[PDB]
Write a protein that binds this ligand. Structure first.
Ligand SMILES: CCCCCCCCCCCCCCCC(=O)OC[C@H](COP(=O)([O-])OCC[N+](C)(C)C)OC(=O)CCCCCCCCCCCCCCC
Ligand code: HEC
Ligand SMILES: COc1c(O)c(C)c(C/C=C(\C)CC/C=C(\C)CC/C=C(/C)CC/C=C(\C)CC/C=C(\C)CCC=C(C)C)c(O)c1OC
Ligand SMILES: CCCCCCCCCCCCCCC(=O)O[C@H](COC(=O)CCCCCCCCCCCC)COP(=O)(O)O
Ligand SMILES: CCCCCCCCCCCCCCCCCC(=O)O[C@H](COC(=O)CCCCCC)COP(=O)(O)OCCN
Lengths: 126, 42, 55, 431, 352, 352, 126
C-alpha cells in the first residue's frame, strides 16, 4: 500500500537533487546491504508482495525468461532459508545484478489503474 | 552441466547402506518413541 | 479416489491436517498455532474434570 | 530349435532357422553404455552412427546388405543382414568395416557430419521424447555416481567434446577378442559360419577390456524435471530389481506381469484381469502404464512408468498402484499367478521367437555374452511353471515390502507429493 | 473360405482372418473403421469381458487392424489353445451383438481417439489427400471416421452383413498344423456364414493424373507426390522406393519417407518431404522433382530391394516376387501433388 | 492524402480513412487482420480507455474493418465534434503503441474469435478457398489469422510502417464540410506521416482457371464456382449476379448466394450452393453449371441491376457506373470450383 | 437391494405356474391400483430408486424420447404432489401404458455386473 507512483516521485526528487542524493544514497545502499536479501540470492523486485491484482497484472506482463529466473530465485531462497544457512559468497546477488527489472511493468499497471479510477469518477465540462 | 550429473551428496551419505541395518535402527527409534508415548498416554 | 478424499468427514481432516500445502521455509514460530490448540484442549479437559468437584 | 556355440577366442553362436528367408550376421560386443566415464559419454552412440554412416551404408547397399546397430547398457551390436546366399559377403564386409580399417570411416568429413547428426538426435530426444527421457533419468538417479547411471544416448555437454582420439581410445579398449561374440541368426548353418570365419582370419584384437572400479549399487532418490508447459505428467518409479543370473529373474518378471500394462483408450485393454483397474478406471487417473522388470549385468530395476493428464490426482494413482504392489507380499491369489504365467509365456515367446532376425541376434548376443550360453525357451517355460505363490510372496518380501524407491518425473508433476509419503506408502501399516 | 497354415516347432502360433472389407469397400465414409473398432465387443453368447478374461487365462491376446483393403482379425496364442481361438473368431464373424450403447460408449470414443491421433500427424493427412485425389471414389475413401457423414448402427450392421461372407475371407495361420486347422474351421460357426460374393474386383481402378489439393495445417509442412501404378510397372516403383530410401541416392537426406502400397490390382507410389520450415520443404521438393524428371538408374538398388522385399514378406498373401530382374531405368512422368502445412509458402504443381 | 467530403443538413457525420492495406498486401498470413484488430488500442499519448470514454462522452463510436483490399477506419459522430475525431484518427495512424501485452491479451483472443466465427460458416471458408485457388499469391492471401504462420509483434510494426503512409490513404467524409475537413487534416498529425509509396498496382492480376480444391467439413455442404473477371467484362458479371439473385431466373431458388467483388483492376464472380444434404447440392450445382453453359440472356435484368447498383453505391470511391447499356448475352466459359462439406458425395470438376 | 434377476426369477416362476398366477395376479393388480402411483401420472419403472451405479447405468442406456417422457412424468408428479391434488382421471396412467420399459436395460446391467463379479473371483481349472 505505497502506490509505486508515489515512491517513484519521492525517489526521483531525491535523486535529481544533488545535496539530498549525496547525503542519503550512502545511507541507502548501506541499508540495502544490511538488509541482507542479497545473501539469500534474491533481488528486490523478487521481494515485493504479489497478492494484490495490480502486482498480479505486472507479473502476467513479465517476459518468460525473467519469470523462470524469478521462480528459481524464489525456490533457492526457500531452500536456503530452510537449511538456515546462507548462499556462498560466489552465489550472492551482486550490486550490478540488482536491477529494477519489474518496476516499469508495475508503474504502467499503476498508471492504468489510476487512469481507470479517474475516468470512472469524472464530471462533465458544462 | 547436464541434468544427468548428480551433485555431491558424498559428505552426507552412509558409507554402508545395508537396507536392513538402517531401517532397523530407524524403526527401533520410532518404536522407542511409541513405547514411551504409550506409557504416557496410559 | 482415496478414502480420505472421498469421505465427507475425512475430507476435512485431509484438507486441514494431512494434505494441506504448507510453505517449506517456515520455522518453529509457525508452530505456536498447533501449540495453542493443544493448550486449549488441556484447559478444557482439566476444566471438566475439575468442575466435577467444584461448588 | 537349437542354439550352438563354439570358441577360438571369438565366440560363434548361431540359431539355424531354416524357415526364414534372410540371415543376419554380426558381432555383438560386451561393452555398452555402462563402461564409459561421464566425460566420454555417448561414444557408443557415435560408433553406432559412424557404422550407420552414409558412405558405409552405401558401400553396404551396393551388395544388398542392410546394416543395423544397437547400443544398450551392457552390450553393443553391429549386425549385417543379407540374403541367405550372401553370408560370405556379409562377413567380408564386416571384416572390411571394423577389422581391416577404421581410418576411412574416421575421416574428418564423415566424423564431423556424424557428430552433427548425433548432436541433432540427442537434442531431439532431450526436448521431444518424454517417457523415454523419464526412464533415462530414472536410471540416472537410481544408480547415481556409478557407471550404470549413464544414458546410452549420451549428453549434449559431453558429446560436443568428443574427437576422433576418444573414438579410437574406446575402440582400442573395448572392441576386443574376449569382449566380443560374432552372431549369426536366420537362415545360416553353424558349420558354414565357423568354416567361413576360419576361412578368413577375422582377429579383432589382443583382448582385456578395462575393469570398472565401482560396482552398481541401488540408491533410493528422486529427480523432478518439472515443466509446466507440457500437456501431461510422465513419471517412472522403481525399486532395485533383479540382475541377470539371478534365481529370482523369472519371478521378478512374473511380478511385473501380474500388474501388466494398460492403455485407457483401447477397449480391450480396459477389460484386463487386473484388480488395479477397478480403482484406476473410475475417475480416469491415467492414460497408460506399464510394469517393467529391467535386468542388467550388475543390478536391475522393477517398477512402472506411466503418463496421465489428470494432473490433480497423481497421488491417487501412485497410492493405488503401491497398495496393489503391497498386495504381492501379503495376499496375492493363485489366479493372478496363473494369469501372469500365461501372459509371460505369451510375451516371452513373442520376444524370443519373433520373425525378425536382427532382434534374435541382439538377444542371443547379449545372453551368450553374459551367461556363456543361451537358455532355450522350453526350459524357460519349465522355470515359469515352477513358480508358486509362496515364491512370489518371498520375493516381494525381499524386494518390495518397505524398500527404497527411485522416482523420476517431468511435465506437470506438481500434484506428485513429497518423497516421504511415496516411500511410506510402500508398507501398508495394516499388516 | 481359403484356409492355409504353415508349421514350425516355434511354441507360439498366430491365426489371422483377412477379410476384403477395408476402406475401399466402405459404403459410407468411415463405416469400415467403425466395424474395425466394433469387432471383439460383446457377442450373442459370451460378453467381451468374458472373452478377455478367458483369453488372458489361456494365454492369448486379440487385435483387429484395418488397412486400405483388408479387415484383419488376428489372434496370437499358445499352440495348444487352437480350437478356442478358432471358435472365438468364428463367433466374432458370425454373431456380434450390435447394441447401441456399445456404439455410444466403447466404439465411438475409440474412433475419436484414432482420428485425433492421425490428424496430429501431417503425413497421414497428406496420404489420405493423395488417395482421395488419385482414386477419388474407390480406393480414395477415407480410412478413418471423422464424422462428416452420419453413420448409424444400422449402417454398420448392413456393412457387416455385406462384408463378412464365406466368399470374402481368408484364414491364415502361422505355426499351425494345417489339416487340424481345416478340421476346426469346418466344425465351427465359421462354416455357416452366409455365402455371399467375393468383393475383389479384377479390373484395374480408374486413376487420375495431374491433380492437386492443398490443406492448411498448423505444424510440420509436408509436400507429397503420388504416382498410380499398373500391375506390370510395380517392381520398378518398388526398386524406386528402396532406391530413394537407402544411401545409394544423393537425395535420401532430402526426403522423409517413400513407399509403395502394393494392392492386388495396382497401388500408389508416395513420396513425402517433411520439415518444420516451409522454405526447406520448397527447395527440397523442387530438387526432388527436378532430379526425378532428369532420370535415374535403378540397377544398383536391385539386390538391396530383393533383401527389403524379403524382410517385408511375412504374410501368406504376398504378391508376385520375380519381377525384379527386368527393371533398368526410371524417368518421372505425370504425378499428383498435395501440400499440407504452411500452404502459402509451399510450391504449386505448375512450378514443379 | 486524398481528402473528399460531401455536405448535407443531416445532424450526424461519419469520417472514414480508407488505406490500401488489406489481405492482398499482407506480408505474412493474416498480418493485416492483426493490424485491424490492433488499431484503436493504446497510443503513445492517450490510452484506449480514455479514447473510449471521451468519445462516448462526446457522442461517437469507432469501427475498424478490413476487407480483401482495404483497411478502413471509420468514426460516426455528431457534427460539431469533427476535430476531435480527425485528431483521434491521426493519432491512431501515426503513434499507436505496439506493446506486447496488448497483443497477448486484447488482440490475439479477438482474432481467435473472428477466426472461430468465420470457420463455423462454410461459405466463408469456400470463398477463401476460391480466392486462394484463383489468385494464389496476390489477392488469394487468407483474410483471417489462423496461426499456421508465426506472426510476431515486429512483423505487425513493420507492416504498419509499410502500409500507413501519406501516399496510401484516402480520407472520406460524409455529412462533413469539405474545406474545414481539409484544414483539420492539414493541422493534425496526419500530415506528418512518412510519405511512402502507393501500393495500388495498376496491372491486372495473374488469374488461373480450371482449378479445384476440396475441403472436408462437418455441417452444411457447399459447392461454389468462381470466375476471374477483366476490367471491361465486369458489368456483364454484375448483371449476371443480380440476374441470378432476383426472381427473373428459373434457378434463383437453387443457388444460395451469388455476388461480384469489384476491385480496382478486376474481381471474382462467386456463386454458392448451400444445403445440409449432399445430393441436393449435387443435383443443384450440376443443373446450374449445365444451364449456364447452355447460355442466358441478361437483357431483362438491366434496370434491376441499375437499381441494385444504386442502392449499393454509397461510398465516395464507387467504381465506373456506365457500362450497363452494352451487356446482352452470357455463356459460361472456364471456371474454378471448390467443394466444402461432405466431400465424398459432392461432384467433381470433371463431371460438371 | 433386491437384485432384479432374483425378483424376475420369482415373478416368472409365479407367472409360468397356472395355479399361482390364477391365485395371486388379481391380488397383484389390486395391490397396484391401491398403490396409487398411477394417479400421480407415473409408471412403476419411473419409481425405482436410481441412486446406485447399476441403475444409473441403465438410465444412461435408455433412448432419448423415453428419457424426456420420464423427465416430464417426474416433474408433473412433483407438481401434483406439491399442490396436494391428484391428476384428473383423463390424465391417469392407464393399465396398458404401464409398460415395463426400463426392465430389460436394468436386467442386462444386472447380468453384466454379475458376470464381472464372477470372473473377478474365479479359480483355475487345474
Ligand atoms: C493420542 C496419543 C496416543 C498415543 C498412543 C501410541 C500407541 C503406539 C504408537 C506407536 C506405534 O506402535 O506405531 C506403529 C505404527 C507404524 O509406525 P511406522 O513405523 O511409522 O509404520 C511403519 C510400519 N512398519 C513398516 C514398521 C511395519 O504406527 C501406527 O499405527 C500409528 C499410531 C498413531 C497413534 C496416534
Ligand atoms: C469447566 C470448564 C473450564 C474450562 C473449559 C476452562 N476452565 Fe478455567 N477454570 C475452571 C474452573 C472450575 C476453575 C476454578 C477452579 C480452579 O481455579 O482451580 C477455573 C479457573 C481458571 C483460572 C484461575 C486458576 C487459579 O486457580 O487461579 C484461570 C486463569 C483459568 N481458569 C483460565 C482458563 C482459560 C484461559 C481457559 C480456556 C481458554 C479455561 N480456563 C477453560 C474451569 C474451566
Ligand atoms: C496452517 O497449518 C495448520 C493447519 O492447517 C491446522 C489445521 C493445524 C491444526 C489446528 C488445530 C489442531 C487446532 C484445532 C483445535 C480445535 C478444533 C479445538 C477443539 C477443542 C476441543 C477440546 C474439542 C472439544 C471436545 C471435548 C470438550 C471433549 C471432552 C470431553 C470429555 C473429556 C468428557 C469426559 C467425560 C467422561 C465421562 C469420559 C495446524 O496446527 C497447522 O499448523 C501446522
Ligand atoms: C487436537 C489436539 C491437537 C494437538 C496438536 C498435536 C500436533 C502433533 C500431533 C502428533 C500426532 C502424531 C501422529 C503421527 C503418525 O501417526 O504417523 C504415522 C506413524 O508414525 C508413528 O507411528 C509415530 C510414532 C508414534 C508417535 C505417537 C505420538 C503420540 C503423542 C501425541 C501427543 C500430542 C497429542 C504415519 O507415519 P508415516 O506416514 O511416516 O509412515
Ligand atoms: C464444527 C465442526 C466440528 C468438527 C466436525 C468436522 C470434523 C469431523 C472430523 C471427524 C473425523 C472422524 C470421522 C471418521 C469417521 C469416518 C467413518 C465414515 O465416514 O464412514 C461412513 C459411515 O459413518 C458412520 O456410519 C458414522 C460416522 C460417525 C462419525 C462419528 C465421529 C461411510 O461413508 P461413505 O459413504 O464415504 O462410505 C461408502 C462405503 N464405501
Amino acid at each position: 500500500p505505497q502506490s509505486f507512483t508515489s515512491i517513484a516521485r519521492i525517489g526521483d526528487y531525491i535523486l535529481k537533487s544533488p545535496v539530498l542524493s549525496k547525503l542519503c544514497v550512502p545511507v541507502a545502499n548501506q541499508f540495502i546491504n544490511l538488509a541482507g536479501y542479497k545473501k539469500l540470492g534474491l533481488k528486490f523486485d523478487d521481494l515485493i508482495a504479489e497478492e494484490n491484482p495490480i502486482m498480479q497484472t505486472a507479473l502476467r506482463r513479465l517476459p518468460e525468461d525473467e519469470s523462470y529466473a524469478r521462480a528459481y530465485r524464489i525456490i533457492r531462497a526457500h531452500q536456503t532459508e530452510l537449511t538456515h544457512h546462507l548462499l556462498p559468497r560466489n552465489e550472492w546477488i551482486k550490486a550490478q545484478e540488482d536491477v529494477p527489472y519489474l518496476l516499469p511493468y508495475i508503474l504502467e499497471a499503476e498508471a492504468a489503474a489510476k487512469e481507470k479510477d479517474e475516468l470512472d469518477n469524472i464530471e462533465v465540462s458544462k | 552441466k547436464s541434468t544427468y550429473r548428480t551433485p555431491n551428496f558424498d559428505d552426507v551419505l552412509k558409507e554402508n547402506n545395508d537396507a536392513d541395518k538402517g531401517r532397523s535402527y530407524a524403526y527401533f527409534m520410532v518404536g522407542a518413541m511409541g513405547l514411551l508415548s504409550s506409557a504416557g498416554a496410559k | 479416489m482415496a478414502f480420505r478424499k472421498s469421505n465427507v468427514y475425512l475430507s476435512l481432516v485431509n484438507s486441514y491436517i494431512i494434505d494441506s500445502p504448507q510453505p517449506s521455509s517456515i520455522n518453529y514460530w509457525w508452530n505456536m498455532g498447533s501449540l495453542l490448540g493443544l493448550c486449549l484442549v488441556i484447559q478444557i479437559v482439566t476444566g471438566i474434570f475439575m468442575a466435577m468437584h467444584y461448588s | 530349435a537349437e542354439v550352438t556355440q563354439l570358441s577360438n577366442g571369438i565366440v560363434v553362436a548361431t540359431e539355424h532357422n531354416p524357415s526364414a528367408h534372410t540371415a543376419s550376421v554380426g558381432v555383438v560386443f560386451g561393452s555398452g553404455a555402462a563402461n564409459e566415464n561421464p566425460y566420454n559419454n555417448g561414444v557408443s552412440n557415435l560408433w553406432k552412427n559412424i557404422f550407420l554412416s552414409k558412405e558405409n551404408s552405401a558401400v553396404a547397399a551396393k551388395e544388398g546388405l542392410a546394416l543395423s546397430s544397437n547400443i544398450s547398457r551392457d552390450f553393443q551390436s553391429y549386425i549385417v543382414s543379407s540374403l541367405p546366399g550372401s553370408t560370405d559377403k556379409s562377413l567380408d564386409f564386416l571384416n572390411q568395416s571394423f577389422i581391416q580399417q577404421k581410418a576411412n570411416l574416421l575421416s574428418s568429413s564423415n566424423f564431423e557430419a556424424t557428430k552433427k547428426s548425433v548432436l541433432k538426435q540427442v537434442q531431439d530426444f532431450e526436448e521431444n521424447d518424454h517417457p523415454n527421457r523419464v526412464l533415462e533419468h530414472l536410471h540416472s538417479t537410481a544408480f547415481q555416481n556409478t557407471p550404470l547411471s549413464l544414458p546410452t544416448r549420451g549428453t549434449l555437454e559431453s558429446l560436443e567434446n568428443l574427437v576422433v582420439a576418444d573414438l579410437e581410445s574406446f575402440a582400442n579398449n573395448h572392441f576386443l577378442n574376449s569382449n566380443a561374440v560374432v552372431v549369426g541368426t536366420g537362415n545360416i548353418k553353424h558349420e558354414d559360419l565357423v568354416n567361413s570365419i576360419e576361412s578368413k582370419n577375422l582377429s579383432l584384437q589382443t583382448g582385456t577390456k578395462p575393469v570398472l572400479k565401482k560396482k552398481a549399487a541401488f540408491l533410493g532418490s528422486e529427480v523432478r524435471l518439472r515443466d509446466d508447459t507440457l500437456p501431461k505428467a510422465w513419471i517412472s518409479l522403481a525399486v532395485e530389481g533383479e540382475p541377470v543370473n539371478s534365481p529370482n529373474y523369472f519371478v521378478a518378471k512374473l511380478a511385473a506381469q501380474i500388474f501388466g500394462s494398460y492403455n485407457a483408450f483401447e477397449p480391450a485393454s480396459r477389460l484386463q484381469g487386473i484388480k488395479l483397474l477397478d480403482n484406476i478406471q473410475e475417475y480416469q487417473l491415467c492414460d497408460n502404464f506399464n510394469h517393467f522388470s529391467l535386468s542388467y549385468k550388475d543390478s536391475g530395476l522393477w517398477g512402472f512408468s506411466t503418463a496421465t493428464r489428470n494432473v490433480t490426482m497423481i497421488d491417487d494413482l501412485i497410492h493405488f498402484t503401491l497398495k496393489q504392489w503391497n498386495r504381492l507380499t501379503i495376499s496375492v491369489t493363485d489366479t493372478e499367478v496363473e494369469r501372469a504365467k500365461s501372459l509371460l509365456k505369451l510375451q516371452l515367446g513373442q520376444l524370443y521367437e519373433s520373425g525378425n532376425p536382427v532382434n534374435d541376434a541382439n538377444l542371443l548376443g547379449a545372453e551368450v555374452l553374459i551367461k556363456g550360453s543361451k537358455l532355450s525357451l522350453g526350459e524357460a517355460f519349465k522355470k515359469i511353471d515352477a513358480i508358486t505363490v509362496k515364491d512370489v510372496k518371498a520375493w516381494a518380501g525381499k524386494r518390495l515390502w518397505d524398500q527404497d524407491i527411485a522416482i523420476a518425473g517431468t511435465g506437470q508433476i506438481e500434484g506428485l507429493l513429497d518423497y516421504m509419503r511415496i516411500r511410506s506408502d510402500m508398507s501398508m501399516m495394516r499388516w | 473360405l481359403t484356409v492355409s497354415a504353415r508349421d514350425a516347432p516355434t511354441k507360439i502360433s498366430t491365426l489371422a482372418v483377412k477379410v476384403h472389407g477395408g476402406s475401399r469397400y466402405a459404403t459410407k465414409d468411415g463405416v469400415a473403421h467403425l466395424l474395425n473398432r466394433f469387432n471383439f465387443q460383446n457377442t450373442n453368447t459370451r460378453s467381451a469381458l468374458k472373452l478377455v478374461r478367458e483369453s488372458e487365462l489361456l494365454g492369448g491376446t486379440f487385435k483387429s487392424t484395418l488397412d486400405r483393403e483388408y479387415i484383419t482379425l488376428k489372434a496370437t496364442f499358445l499352440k495348444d489353445d487352437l480350437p478356442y481361438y478358432v471358435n472365438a473368431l468364428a463367433d466374432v464373424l458370425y454373431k456380434t451383438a450390435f447394441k447401441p450403447h456399445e456404439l455410444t460408449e466403447s466404439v465411438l470414443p475409440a474412433a475419436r481417439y484414432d482420428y485425433a491421433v492421425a490428424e496430429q500427424c501431417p503425413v497421414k493427412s497428406a496420404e489420405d489427400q493423395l488417395y482421395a485425389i488419385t482414386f477419388r471414389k474407390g480406393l480414395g475413401n477415407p480410412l478413418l471416421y471423422d464424422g462428416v457423414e452420419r453413420v448409424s448402427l444400422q449402417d454398420i450392421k448392413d456393412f457387416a452383413d455385406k462384408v463378412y461372407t464365406k466368399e470374402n475371407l481368408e484364414v491364415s495361420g502361422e505355426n499351425v498344423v494345417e489339416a487340424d486347422l481345416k478340421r476346426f474351421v469346418d466344425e465351427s460357426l465359421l462354416s455357416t456364414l452366409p455365402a455371399g460374393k467375393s468383393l475383389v474386383s479384377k479390373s484395374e481402378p480408374k486413376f487420375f493424373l495431374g491433380e492437386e489439393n492443398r490443406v492448411r495445417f498448423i505444424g510440420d509442412s509436408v509436400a507429397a507426390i503420388g504416382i498410380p501404378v499398373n500391375k506390370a510397372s510395380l517392381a520398378q516403383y518398388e526398386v524406386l522406393a528402396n532406391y530413394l530410401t537407402s544411401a545409394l541416392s544423393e537425395l535420401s537426406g532430402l526426403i522423409s519417407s517413400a513407399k509403395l502400397d502394393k494392392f492386388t490390382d495396382g497401388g500408389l507410389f508416395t513420396l513425402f518431404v517433411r520439415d518444420q520450415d516451409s522454405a526447406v520443404v520448397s527447395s527440397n521438393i523442387k530438387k526432388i522433382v527436378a532430379d526425378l524428371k532428369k532420370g535415374k538408374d535403378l540397377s544398383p538398388a536391385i539386390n538391396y530391394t530383393k533383401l527389403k522385399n524379403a524382410v517385408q514378406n511375412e504374410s501368406v498373401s504376398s504378391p508376385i516376387e520375380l519381377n525384379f530382374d527386368a527393371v533398368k531405368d526410371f524417368k518421372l512422368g505425370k504425378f499428383n501433388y498435395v501440400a499440407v502445412g504452411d500452404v502459402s509458402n509451399l510450391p504449386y504443381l505448375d512450378e514443379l
